[PDB]
Symmetry: T
């Protein structure tokens, strides 16, 4: 699907419901609603739209990726803690044959604890953006626009 014909699915993993409420040095002071607005504006500049969601549930994220597979033009995902533990989310992303996928981490996971160094999502994501703050979601949208083009 193109940007004109279907929304970009923007998915957020566990604990990102609290974004902006603490740890500004690591995660910044923008809320998840602030991130949604950034994505909406970036996508509008390419004539597309976004379907922005957040869950603390691994299986719900799996269900949402299956929905994106059929109805969306691409996926921008910040898997949060599930990046490091979820083979199930990797496997769900592997069912999206041909769909542009971009993984985003607000923080630079490579400077953090060793358990954050590996991401199962990175094995499938086309592109991976880390440590570029909430600006990394706008890079994600930009990349999806380039790949759907």
């Amino acid at each position: 699907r193109s940007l004109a014909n279907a929304p970009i699915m923007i998915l957020n993993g566990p604990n990102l419901n609290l974004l902006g409420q603490r740890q500004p040095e690591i995660y910044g002071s923008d809320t998840l609603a602030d991130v949604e607005a950034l994505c909406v504006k970036a996508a509008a500049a390419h004539g597309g739209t976004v379907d922005f969601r957040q869950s603390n549930h691994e299986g719900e994220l799996v269900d949402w990726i299956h929905e994106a597979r059929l109805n969306h033009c691409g996926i921008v995902i910040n898997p949060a803690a599930y990046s490091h533990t979820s083979v199930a989310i990797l496997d769900a992303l592997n069912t999206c044959d041909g769909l542009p996928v971009v993984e985003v981490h607000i923080s630079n996971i490579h400077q953090r604890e060793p358990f954050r160094h590996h991401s199962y999502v990175s094995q499938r994501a086309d592109g991976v953006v880390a440590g570029c703050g909430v600006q990394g979601y706008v890079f994600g949208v930009e990349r999806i626009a380039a790949l759907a083009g």
Copy 2:
């Protein structure tokens, strides 16, 4: 229990709802409905029945293992990605004292990525069948029939 007195529980993990829709070289062209019909027929030859289910949710699979512990004669389980990550499912199976359990993988996990080589489920499953296609489910039913009898 016996096969005459209670159904065999057949559980399927995440992403298996899309079985048959892609990657036929790895997973075959049969759907989960097709697999259920194979199971039904196998169990009927021993005078039993099957209770066939699929979920993307780790805790729901744990709930359904607890249900089987009280109401079913055995468990045939393809845990899918949770095979490799879920201690919780292993611990649910460990509560099934004396209940026959057979783990099934459609694909030969030993030939795939190194993160697929280890299964927590194998530490409790009585028997483990891998790489026998969807025919592996039928072996699971036949093994349960032999262990219940």
Copy 3:
């Protein structure tokens, strides 16, 4: 918050709904209701109350931790299998800046399988009690009382 102003959240992870129904040599013969009663009693000695819950779902435990963050004076948590697998639970506890957290394991995980030796929760928990039986939940409450103090 103080114990006088808000309850202590007591959280139990997967399979603990079956406590007391098997494996008494490892887990004892007390049920979760019995454990709840021990907690209520220990908190009442400090003029406090408890909010005792159990779930098999990782995401639900995350949600409950966010709830505690806002409404409770501390968290006593037995993460069960999720101790060993959940970065998501650890990141949920990390959002509880300044809240006392005590991790409890009924069994001595250090004598058990190697996959049980590490817990993600222990990186954030203030205190960790293992192998003191259900009495460890009483120690948990006492520790929360001292810390809220």
Copy 4:
């Protein structure tokens, strides 16, 4: 070949000559002759025949695999201890381009010592059956019949 045109080679590795003479809790009370008879019946149900053999010598197994490559319709193999050590037997099975191969372990190797967890044969075998008892030999014959078919 088809089952009608050539026998299924069934190969057994070291120490399996003593099957049934000890450790019934691990290996059962059936002898290797008993297993051969189970196999003859199982193949007969599909119109086929078996060529059942046992050796304690790695090189002899290698030679029999080369023989099977030219004269048999498939290989069912219980490599026994050589499962864990023999690159040479893996390399012999790799020469059997297009020939169905099924690996069988009576015992659930995944519950045993860590040196039994890895099998070189599993990298080539189409299907691997473990912990289904001597019934796993019947499953192997069934899977060869399905693949040859």
Copy 5:
């Protein structure tokens, strides 16, 4: 032995003679004599007594464990650095067949350097309390009281 018939042995390993003289953020401001008084009071509520000792010598701790084996109703032990290095103290505790043993760490060793994450003492200790401050020694006395009971 019951608490009424014999003292509880409380053993402290190297450098704990300086407890409370520095690093209050990790170890607190209480001295070892303050700890002994906390223990004396906890045991007296159960009609017991304590024999509280500290040594910088691995061998002397072994010697004291052999003494407790014959004359004491349980052992509460903070092995300090020897937790991480002493097979000899583990072996000594192993000789105390049926004697209740609780290991205590004032600090949460799981949040510290990786060499502190493993304890040889935890392989035999019935229960292990870490990161509950000096209050952990009171938990130890209470657990010994319950086990001796």
Copy 6:
């Protein structure tokens, strides 16, 4: 320094002089000169300029990072093979106290050989962009512009 007062230094490591001349599936069909033009255009949208360079020499990259430290407003660096081996380039970037640094990889290193999975540069780079193709350089420029502001 601000974008208006000093150029962004854009450094490229070994073998990138051949970009576009082969392996288009991994690295694309754009040349390094094409990449420079993308960078020039992106910086000019923010009123800035770029100083674009390429070297096969680890010690020359070090020199250029020292130059940037004193004269440039930020660094966008694709260290190429030196990402995986160069502690010297990491230490050079560590001397750039307060300067924004963004690391770029054309390819998704996480999907490639395991020796490409670790980057020493990632330990200092504020942000890391991988597998966004040559568009990642534009993301780099955009992130420097945001951080210099």
Copy 7:
């Protein structure tokens, strides 16, 4: 069986046919025939006899172990290189339920290459003698005599 009733099987692995022909600093200057005569004498002192053998073939050693299992009073084995590689020989010795088995190495394998530090045979052997030269074989016989008694 007793020593009076049946011989002690003395088995030697690969390359020991050349004992005494080189490397006297590691293996001594006695030949295998000289070792056999030492064994014959030691067994004669206890009213017993020996059946002394050497082979370069793993399978042959397995066959000889199965023979000893039925016809001999114990096994003294120097498995030579197969000590480090042969799961098959370990599994053969495991069939010898109740039979005394002593493993002998002329050299001190623990001072040699790291690949010599682990022996599969040591997992079953009752006793293991290393670095005692050919005199170790005499100790082997004496231990068998004590265990058969």
Copy 8:
């Protein structure tokens, strides 16, 4: 010994009897007989002769190395799978004090599976040639000629 007084022993390990019958991309289209003819021609240019053998049995290869130790001027060996598993063959080559030994792999083992990266044989072989095709056997012969002369 010189090439004029004794033959060069050329030894081939398991599965090499099928050389040229499959996998030409890895092993080429020449058969083992073709390889022997190349070696005969190379040795004849130096006035020597070859004694060319192949075996699937580890112990037979050990036996032939002992034979070469007394009767041959050097050994060119392609140990095939035994390269990766056989301490026994390493130990047999170690008995050939002063005899030139060259190890040959047709394929480039370093580009293949990780289990093929290590060779026990390489610890004793004077020279090791890998990935030069069947031409590596000719190199082997030429190096023996230089070492013996």
Copy 9:
């Protein structure tokens, strides 16, 4: 020195003072005094004498090794837990240039916990006897007698 001119030092590490009091399946039912008497008899058959000692202190063992270096004809040592942890004792034994040293373990340390598999003493000991019960001390004395001769 010779056996006629100076005693054999027989040293025992921690917890061996309790030998025979428990765990007869692992350590036998003989006491340390019984072992000493065995040693006295074995040395006397060679015209020698023994100096038998036990300590729980690593430093004391070190001191006794220095004493043996100047006054005794050899050392038989069961380092007990210090086998696994004491570089100091290894370093003490390394000062005994030319003195025969035999390490003894009553139990077969290779069948036990992995932390018992490695001994620092085995690096210097001439001979190492394990799993031969208290009879291994007699083998130690005999080996010292042979080496002193």
Copy 10:
């Protein structure tokens, strides 16, 4: 290119300028001039020529590999220390699509320190010759000649 149309590039890494001035037991007594002459002679026998060079600089070797890519018929490379450290040299060789490359080590790196066992160049080199002395360069030229044919 063919050998008649373009020279064979022979590259030598760091410290090889001192070849023959020391360590003759490892490296021999031939100088680099001697090696060059060997190469010239071997190439001339195939109607070819050589371009023989040495550098201590990783980046200069990269540059020379790029030159060869365009102007030479193949590369014989002894990367010396860079063999073990240089991803940049491997990636330069990876740009030589279709060009024959042979890696040469004078010494048998497999018998030396463990840090010399792995070579990054071996991942791309067609053939790898180790331990055949300076004669290995002659084999390298011969292999280039066969591959260019």
Copy 11:
């Protein structure tokens, strides 16, 4: 403290009482008394004094560190074998907040056995001198004088 007000504590670990009596190639021919006189002179050149001690006992070293913490101006310590094993000595040095500590090894531990490569002491020592012979004790005194100054 200053050098004028208190002596520099110079501590030596196990086996250094025999310094100079053997292994001169590793440890030199100076005795520990010789080293003490070198230290007295080096300290006198700065107007200071030394308190030089040696012990084979880990806990005595800990006791002496605690003494130094209160009464000395610095510590120069050669922990000998305890450098690699003692967390306890590391913890005692950690109690010396603000006191200059320099670790000295006579030998170059980095050229020796891998178990000597790591030192727990080096985590707290300000400076670490290795392989400079007994002259390293003079460097240690010199550094304490500079830090105290």
Copy 12:
């Protein structure tokens, strides 16, 4: 060469040209020029001279080591980041047969990131001084003076 006949070569690795310009807590406030003057003064006390150099290029350091080999009386080297990555510098130092070499690190690399813990240079350096500040260079000069004289 003696200190009277030839200068001491003092080599400095990458980034040390910025010494004193930042990170005084780790590296001090002295510049490289200040360090050179300390060296010149230390050497002059022994009647010697220094040749002090710094480079960011690995091959230039190799070249300067080859120069020292022929013209200088020893090497004092702070390899900076190359300590951790350069097998080439180790190999250059290994050509300096009989020349005294002292490695110096201003910082205590053992307290820093794990990648700084290993130094290839330490395998060849006679002595290694770490964490003694710039004074470590003076100890280097003194050690060279003692070894040369």
